Amino acid sequence: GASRLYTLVLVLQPQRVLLGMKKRGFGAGRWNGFGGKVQEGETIEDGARRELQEESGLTVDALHKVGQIVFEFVGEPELMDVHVFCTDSIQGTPVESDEMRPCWFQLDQIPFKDMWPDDSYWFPLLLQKKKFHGYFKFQGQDTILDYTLREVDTV
Numbered sequence: 001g002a003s004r005l006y007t008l009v010l011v012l013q014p015q016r017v018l019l020g021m022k023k024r025g026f027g028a029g030r031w032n033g034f035g036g037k038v039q040e041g042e043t044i045e046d047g048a049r050r051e052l053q054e055e056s057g058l059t060v061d062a063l064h065k066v067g068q069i070v071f072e073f074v075g076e077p078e079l080m081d082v083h084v085f086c087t088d089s090i091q092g093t094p095v096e097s098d099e100m101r102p103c104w105f106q107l108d109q110i111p112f113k114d115m116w117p118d119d120s121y122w123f124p125l126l127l128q129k130k131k132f133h134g135y136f137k138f139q140g141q142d143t144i145l146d147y148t149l150r151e152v153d154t155v
């Protein structure tokens, strides 16, 4: 099956994580990291930085690749190849964008019920400073039917 490149960025500080609420459309109200498609004409890391900046107004001094996840959807031939990054080196104050409303969450209050269902599986690994490869099969946007998570030394 064919695949397309995407990014996902977690701003993860010692005691808190930044998530953004999706403001627009039928998917509004879901809370998640920052990211989008990787464009022709930018690197994966360029795309991750661009989406972070566009969505939260933040720039970073460094991004660390912590995961790679393949998403498959029931009835959909195209796969998502998602490169997952973490940062604790943001260079300003999170601010609202057209698309996302950033908010800080304490690490004992991660809003899993209001996040993409896959986050419940891999975000715990990220908190343990583990790197991973993942695969998730979705029914629609709310349900996982199959998955695999593997700890790796190198992403």
Ligand SMILES: CCOCc1nc2c(N)nc3ccccc3c2n1CC(C)(C)O
Residues within 6 Å of the ligand: 006, 007, 008, 022, 032, 033, 034, 035, 036, 037, 071, 080, 082, 116, 118, 119
């Ligand atoms: C609006 C920015 O949303 C960040 C995000 N977070 C997740 C997530 N936790 N899980 C996902 C599962 C399947 C498809 C996309 C996503 C996803 N996405 C969309 C994606 C393009 C992969 O970053």
